[PDB]
Amino acid sequence: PFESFLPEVIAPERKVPYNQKLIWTGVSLLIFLILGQIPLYGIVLRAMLASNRGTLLELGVSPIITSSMIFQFLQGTQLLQIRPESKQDRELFQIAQKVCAIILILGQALVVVMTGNYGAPLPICLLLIFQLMFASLIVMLLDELLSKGYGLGSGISLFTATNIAEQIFWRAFAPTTVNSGRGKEFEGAVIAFFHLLAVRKDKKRALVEAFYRTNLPNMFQVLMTVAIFLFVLYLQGFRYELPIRSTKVRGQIGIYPIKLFYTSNTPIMLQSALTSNIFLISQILFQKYPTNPLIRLIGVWGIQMALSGLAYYIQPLMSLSEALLDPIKTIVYITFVLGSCAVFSKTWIEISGTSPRDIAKQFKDQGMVINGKRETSIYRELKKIIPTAAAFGGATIGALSVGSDLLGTLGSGASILMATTTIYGYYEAAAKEGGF
Amino acid sequence: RVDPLVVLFLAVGFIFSVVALHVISKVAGKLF
Amino acid sequence: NYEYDEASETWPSFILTGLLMVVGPMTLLQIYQFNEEVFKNLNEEYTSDEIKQFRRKFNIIIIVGWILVAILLQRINSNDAQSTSHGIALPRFLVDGSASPLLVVCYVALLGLILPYFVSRWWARTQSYTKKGIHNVTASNFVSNLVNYKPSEIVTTDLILHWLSFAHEFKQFFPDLQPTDFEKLLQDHINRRDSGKLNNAKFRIVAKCHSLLHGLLDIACGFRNLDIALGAINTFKCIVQAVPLTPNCQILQLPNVDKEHFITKTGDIHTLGKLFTLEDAKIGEVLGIKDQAKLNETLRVASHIPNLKIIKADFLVPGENQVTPSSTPYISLKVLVRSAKQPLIPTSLIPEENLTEPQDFESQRDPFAMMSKQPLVPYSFAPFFPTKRRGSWCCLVSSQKDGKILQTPIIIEKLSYKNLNDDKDFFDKRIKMDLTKHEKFDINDWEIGTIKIPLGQPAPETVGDFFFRVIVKSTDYFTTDLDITMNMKVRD
Amino acid sequence: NDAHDLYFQIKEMSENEKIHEKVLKAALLNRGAESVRRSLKLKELAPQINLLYKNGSIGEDYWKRFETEVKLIELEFKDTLQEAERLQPGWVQLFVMVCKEICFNQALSRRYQSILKRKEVCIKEWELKINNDGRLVN
Amino acid sequence: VEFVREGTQFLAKCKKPDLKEYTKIVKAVGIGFIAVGIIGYAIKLIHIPIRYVIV
Amino acid sequence: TLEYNANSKLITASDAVVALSTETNIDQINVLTTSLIGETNPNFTPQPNEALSKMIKGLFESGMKNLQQKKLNEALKNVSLAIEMAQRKRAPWEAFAIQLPELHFMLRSKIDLCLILGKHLEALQDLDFLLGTGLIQPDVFVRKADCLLKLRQWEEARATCERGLALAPEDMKLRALLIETARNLAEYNG
C-alpha cells in the first residue's frame, strides 16, 4: 500500500443509458482499429498486413492480459488474503494491477527496442520507445473506460470478437489477387465467385471451378460456416430454470438459470495446448532417436505429419477424405477429444468455485430455497444438475470444434463460439435491463 | 479524472501527430 | 510489393460484388414486404380548418444500383478478356497519378475535422435532455419553483400556466416572444379566444405542453406533494378539452352547446348521469340547440366517455395468502368501465370467476403479464387539441397518516371499453323496469378490467392496520374518477 | 429575493442619515431568522433532491449548485453571527435562540395572515353566492 | 452408459427456445456480427493505399 | 429604495411598485422595531410577557361569559378581538410552545361559535388553517365535513370523512356523515 497519482477514469455517478453506451463502444472500437494500422516512424508483398508487427499496436493487449492472469493466479493460490469486508484492499488490488502493468510495459518496450529488428543506431530510439509507451497507455485507458461503465462490457473480449469477425470477413471478401501461372485469381470466395460467373461466360464449368477451389477459399466453406453459426446460435438458448423462492422477504419469486454452456471455454484451450505440446514433444523425440522398441510405438514421423503412432492417432482430421480413409483413427480421435473435454470441464467447475457446494452456500447466504423442496436438500439437488450440465456442455463444445475442423469452415468452432458468446452476453444484458 | 472526450482527443492527436511526422519526412525526402 | 490494376481488369468485378451485396438483400426485403374507435370519424367533422392546415403543414437506391450493376456488367463483358506475383484490385491512378495527395488529405480531413466535431455535437446534444423527455433548464426551473413554494398559497390553473410559461423549450421555437406572451397564448387557448396572428405558435406550444405537464407531475410526485399533482392533472384536462375549470364542466365539454342559455336557465344539472335522467328531447331542449341531426351527435358523444367503478380492491403478495411484516405486496384493482347512461348492476351478479387470481408459478412469478394483454384505449374526442391523443389514466397512491404521495405515478394505457358498445343499448336508465331480468342480459358478456400498481416499498415491520389512499384520474375527459381508501392488515 | 441586501441598505442609510440604533438590530434579527429558516429547509429537502438526481430526472449541474448553496448558507450564517457580535458585545449565546424562535413565530403569522386572501379564491372557484353575514343565498 | 442417459434426461428437462424467440436471437446476433465485421474490413481495406502513399 | 421616518421610526418603501417579498420583509422589520422600542431590557429573554397574557385572558373570559347569557353576536366579536390582540400586540421572540396553544384554544371556541351562528365559509377556513398548522384530531374532520356538506361540496366532504375514519375507526358520528355524504353524492350523480 502507498500513495499513487496515476491517470484513471472515474465511474459515472448515475447509470448511463443504452444509446450513449452503444455509441461509446463504437467509438472506442473505431479508435482501437485505426490505432493498429499505422506504422512507426524511425523503423528502416505487404509483410505487415497479416500480423500487427511493425505498427503502433506492437504490444497490444498482451501486457494487460499478462498482468491480469498473473494476479488472478496470485489470488487463486491464496497468497493475497483479500477480504471483501473492506473497500480499501480492493482499491489497493486494482492499483497493483496498474503498477504491475506499467512496469511490464516498460520492460517489454525496452526489450523490443534493444533487440528487435528496428535497428541498433538515440533520438530515434527515444521516439520508438515513446510511441509504443503512448499507444499502450492509450489502450489501457480505453479498456478502463469501457469497463468502468461507459461501454456494454469489457474491452478485451470485444477486441477479440472484433478480430475474429474481421478475419472471417477478410477470408471471404478480400480484394487481393494472386497470379500463379494460370492467371489472376481473387483471394476471396464471393468476389471470385462473381468474377468467374461474369467474365468466364462458361457457367457449367465456371460454377464448379469456383465452388470447389482446392487451393483457396470457396463458397462451400461459406455455406458451412453460415450453417455452423446458425447452429451455435440455436444451442445458446438452452437453459435449465429451477424455481426458487425467498424466505427473508416473502413475496420474491424467481428462477435460477443453469445454462448448457456452463464453463468459460478455458478447458478447450487447455486441452488444445496439451495435445499440441505432446505432439511436438513426440516429434522432437522421434527426431532425436530414429529407432527404438518403445519410441517406434509411441510415435513415427514421415511424409511433416506423423504416421503409425500415438501422435498419429491423436492428430486432428483435416477433411472428409482422411475421415473416410480409416474409421479406427476417426473413432479414437472422437472419443479422446470428447472425453478429455468432459473431464476438463468437470475439473474446472470443481476448481473455479462454481461447484454445487458453492451454489448451495450462496443459496443459504441469500436465504433462497427451492420451490417444491426442503431447505436441507439444495446441495443434494444441485449435485444432480450442475455436473451433468458442465460435462455435456464440454462434450458439445468439443464435438462442435471437431465438426468445424472437419467440414473446413472459414473459422474454427472455438473462435466462432467465443464471438457468439461475447455478443450474446451484450444482447442478453440489454434485454434483461431494458433498452433499444 | 479523465473524461471520454479527453481520451478521444488524445487518441486523435497522437494519430495525427504520427501521420504528420510521416508526411513531413516524406515531403522532405522528396524535395531535398 | 502489390501490383495495382493498370488496365481496368479487376476493380470492375470488385465494385460489382460490392454493389450486388447491397442491392440484393434490399430488393429481397422489398418484395417480401382490438378496441373499437368510434370518435376517429366524428373528430374530423368538428375540427376547424385553422387546425387542419396546421396539422397538415407541421426505392430510388434500388433502381440506381441496378442500372449501375448493368453498366458495370456490360463494361466487363465488353472487355477483351512460374512464381507468384501478389496484387490488389484497386485502380492505379488512386496511388500513383496526380490525385495521390488528394487521398491522404481527404483521409486527414475526415479523421480530424468531421469525426471529433460530430461526436462532440452528438454528445453535447444527448447530455442536455432528461430521461423523462424535457430539457435540463426546464427541469431546473420546475425544481426551483417547487422548492420555494409557500404552502399557504392555494394552487389553481392560472398558477400552473404561469409556471409552464417559463419552459426553455418554448424559447427555441420562437426566440422573439416573451414568457408573458406565452402565458397570454395559453389563456387564449383555454378560454377559446382568437390570437389573430400567432395561431401557429399557440398550437405549437399547446401541443408541446403535454410532455411539460407530465414532467411537472413527475417532479411534484417526487417532492411528495398532492395538491400540485392534482392541480397538474386538472390543468391537463383543461388544456385537452379547451375549457376553464368550473363546477358544471362535465356538461360544458360537450361539442355543441351554448353557455349563455344553459347556465342562466338551469342550475341543477352538473354531471352526465343527471343529464341522462331526462328524456331524449328534453336534453336538447335544455342544452338549447333544437336540431335533431345535430342533437344525435352530442348524445352520441355524451354516452361514450368512460366512467369507472370498483368491484374488489385489496393488497396481494405473490406466493402467499396474507400480508406479513417486511413483505413486498402490490395493489390489485378490479374496475368496471361503464357509460354515463347505464344503471347499476349489483356486485352479487358477478360470477366470482372474474374476480379470483390464478395460483400457478408462471402466473405468480410476474403478475403483470395478464394485465399487459388488454387492448389499447381508443382515440379521444378533442376537436380543439391540435394533434391526436389516446386516452390515459394516471393512478397515484398516498398515505392517510400525514397525506404525502409516496411513489411516482403509474400511467396505464391498456384497458377494454367493451361495455360502451352499441349492442348493449337496451340497458337504459330511463326505462326503470329492472333491466337485469331482460332477454339480452347475460352477466358473462360484461367485461371486468384489472389494474395493478406496484407499491415500491415493503410492508412495515410492526403489526397493525395501515391506511392508504388510491386516486385514479383521467387525462382527457371530466368523467367520474376513483378515490378509495384501503388498509393493509400486516398480521404475521 | 431575500432580506440579506435590505439590511446592508439600512446600514448604508444609517451611515449617512443617522437612523436609530434599534432598526439595525431589527434588520439583523430578520436576516438571522431567514438564514435559520433556509438552513432547515435545505436540511429537510436534501434527500428528495438526492433521490431525484439518482433516478435521473434533475440533471447534473443542479446537484452541484445545490451542494454549493448548502455551504453558502453556512457562510452567510457565520457572517451574520460575526456581525451580531460586532454590533453588541456578548450577544451570541442568546441571539441564536432568539432567531430560532422568531423564525417559527413569523412563519406562523404569515400562515395566519394568508387566510383572508385564501377565502376569496375559493368563492371565485366554486361560484358561491354569499350575502352579508357569510350565509348562503343559493 | 449412464453419461449419455443423464445427458438426454437433462436435455429433455431443458427449455429450448421457440421460433418467435429464435428469430429475435438470430436477428440481434447477426446484426452485431455484421456490424463489427464490416467496420473491421473497411478499416483494414482503407489503409493499404494510404500506407502506400504516406510511407 | 426605502424612506426612514423620524418620529415613528417606521421604514416605508416610497417606490412606485414593490414586490411582495420586499413588502413582507419591511412589515416584519417594522414589527420587530416596534417590539424592541417597547421592550426595555437590552438582553431580552424568550420568556413570555405577563400583562399581555392577563389582558388576553380577560377579553376571552368576557367573550365566553356571553355564551351563558345566550348572546351569540357580541361573543364572536369579543373572541375575534382577543385573537386579533394576541396576534398583534405580542412580541415575535416569545416562546412558540406557549404562543401556539393559546391560539388553538381560542380558535376552537371561535370555530364552534361561528358554526352555531351560521357562517360556514369562515369556519371552514379556520378549520383548514387549524388542520394545516399541526392539529389532526377526530373533532376537526367532523366539523370540516359538516361545513363542506352545508356549502355543497360532496367529493371533498367524502375525502374528509374517509381521512377522519382512517384515524379513529371507532367514531360514531363520522360514520353517519359518511352515510349522508354517500346518499347526497348518489343523488348528485344519478
From Swiss-Prot, chain A:
Please provide, alphabetically and separated by semicolons, the GO molecular function terms listed in this UniProt record: peptide transmembrane transporter activity; protein transmembrane transporter activity; protein-transporting ATPase activity; ribosome binding; signal sequence binding
Q: Where in the cell is it found?
A: Endoplasmic reticulum membrane
Q: Which domain of life is it from?
A: Eukaryota
* Residues in the Cytoplasmic compartment per record: 1-21, 75-98, 143-187, 236-265, 350-384
Keyword Ribosomal protein among record annotations: no
One Pfam family hit: SecY
User: Can you supply a Gene Ontology BP term from the record?
Assistant: misfolded protein transport
SUPFAM superfamilies named in the record: Preprotein translocase SecY subunit
> Altering residue 250 to D/G/P/Q/Y: what's the impact?
Severe growth defect
Which key words tag this protein in UniProt?
Answer: Endoplasmic reticulum, Membrane, Protein transport, Translocation, Transmembrane, Transmembrane helix, Transport
Gene Ontology CC terms? endoplasmic reticulum; rough endoplasmic reticulum membrane; Sec61 translocon complex; translocon complex
Which residues span the membrane? 22-44, 55-74, 99-120, 122-142, 188-199, 216-235, 266-286, 330-349, 385-402, 406-427
**Could you tell me the membrane topology recorded for this protein?**
Multi-pass membrane protein
Predominant location: endoplasmic reticulum
**Ranges facing Lumenal side:** 200-215, 287-329, 403-405
UniProt key word Transport: yes
State the family named in the UniProt similarity comment for this chain.
Belongs to the SecY/SEC61-alpha family.
Other notes on this protein? Present with 24800 molecules/cell in log phase SD medium.
This protein is called what? Protein transport protein SEC61
Gene of this entry: SEC61
From Swiss-Prot, chain B:
Compartments in which it is found: Endoplasmic reticulum membrane
Q: Report the principal subcellular site.
A: endoplasmic reticulum
Keyword Transmembrane carried by entry: yes
Drop me one GO molecular function for this one.
protein transmembrane transporter activity
Enumerate the UniProt keywords alphabetically. Answer: Endoplasmic reticulum, Membrane, Protein transport, Translocation, Transmembrane, Transmembrane helix, Transport
* Keyword Transmembrane helix tagged: yes
Which GO BP terms, alphabetically? post-translational protein targeting to membrane, translocation; SRP-dependent cotranslational protein targeting to membrane, translocation
Q: Which sequence ranges are marked TM in the entry? A: 4-24
UniProt subunit comment: Component of the heterotrimeric Sec61 complex, which is composed of SSH1, SBH1 and SSS1. Presumably three to four Sec61 heterotrimers assemble into an oligomeric ring with a central aqueous pore. In cotranslational ER import, the pore diameter varies from 9-15 A in a ribosome-free resting state to 40-60 A in a functional state when associated with the ribosome. The Sec61 complex is part of a channel-forming translocon complex whose composition seem to change dependent upon different functional states.
Family, per entry: Belongs to the SEC61-beta family.
Name under which the protein is recorded: Protein transport protein SBH1
Annotated source species: Saccharomyces cerevisiae (strain ATCC 204508 / S288c)
Q: Which gene encodes it?
A: SBH1
UniProtKB/Swiss-Prot annotation, chain D:
- The entry's keywords: Endoplasmic reticulum, Glycoprotein, Membrane, Protein transport, Signal-anchor, Transmembrane, Transmembrane helix, Transport
Q: Where in the cell is it found?
A: Endoplasmic reticulum membrane
Query: What's its membrane topology?
Result: Single-pass type II membrane protein
Q: Which coarse location class applies to the principal site listed for this UniProt protein?
A: endoplasmic reticulum
A GO CC term attached to the entry: endoplasmic reticulum membrane
| GO BP terms | filamentous growth; post-translational protein targeting to membrane, translocation
Keyword Mitochondrion on entry = no
Residue ranges that the UniProt entry lists as topological domain Cytoplasmic: 1-138
Per its UniProt entry, which superkingdom is the organism in? Eukaryota
Q: Which family does it belong to?
A: To S.pombe SpBC409.21.
This molecule's function is given as:
Acts as a component of the Sec62/63 complex which is involved in SRP-independent post-translational translocation across the endoplasmic reticulum (ER) and functions together with the Sec61 complex and KAR2 in a channel-forming translocon complex. A cycle of assembly and disassembly of Sec62/63 complex from SEC61 may govern the activity of the translocon. SEC66 is required to attach or retain SEC72 in the SEC63 complex. It is essential for growth at elevated temperatures.
Q: What else is known?
A: Present with 7820 molecules/cell in log phase SD medium.
User: How the protein assembles, per its UniProt entry?
Assistant: Component of the heterotetrameric Sec62/63complex composed of SEC62, SEC63, SEC66 and SEC72. The Sec62/63 complex associates with the Sec61 complex to form the Sec complex. Part of a complex consisting of KAR2, SEC63, SEC66 and SEC72.
- What protein name applies here? Translocation protein SEC66
Swiss-Prot record, chain F:
Q: Name one GO molecular function term.
A: protein transmembrane transporter activity
Q: Name one GO biological process term.
A: post-translational protein targeting to membrane, translocation
One GO CC term on file: translocon complex
Could you tell me the superkingdom of the organism this chain comes from? Answer: Eukaryota
InterPro entries for the chain? TPR-like_helical_dom_sf (IPR011990), TPR_rpt (IPR019734)
Alphabetically ordered keywords of this record: Cytoplasm, Protein transport, Transport
Give the location in the cell: Cytoplasm
What quaternary structure, including any partners, is listed in this protein's UniProt entry? Answer: Component of the heterotetrameric Sec62/63complex composed of SEC62, SEC63, SEC71 and SEC72. The Sec62/63 complex associates with the Sec61 complex to form the Sec complex. May interact with protein YLR301W. Part of a complex consisting of KAR2, SEC63, SEC66 and SEC72.
Q: What else is known?
A: Present with 5290 molecules/cell in log phase SD medium.
Q: What does this protein do?
A: Acts as a non-essential component of the Sec62/63 complex which is involved in SRP-independent post-translational translocation across the endoplasmic reticulum (ER) and functions together with the Sec61 complex and KAR2 in a channel-forming translocon complex. A cycle of assembly and disassembly of Sec62/63 complex from SEC61 may govern the activity of the translocon.
**Protein name per UniProt:** Translocation protein SEC72
Q: Which gene underlies this protein? A: SEC72
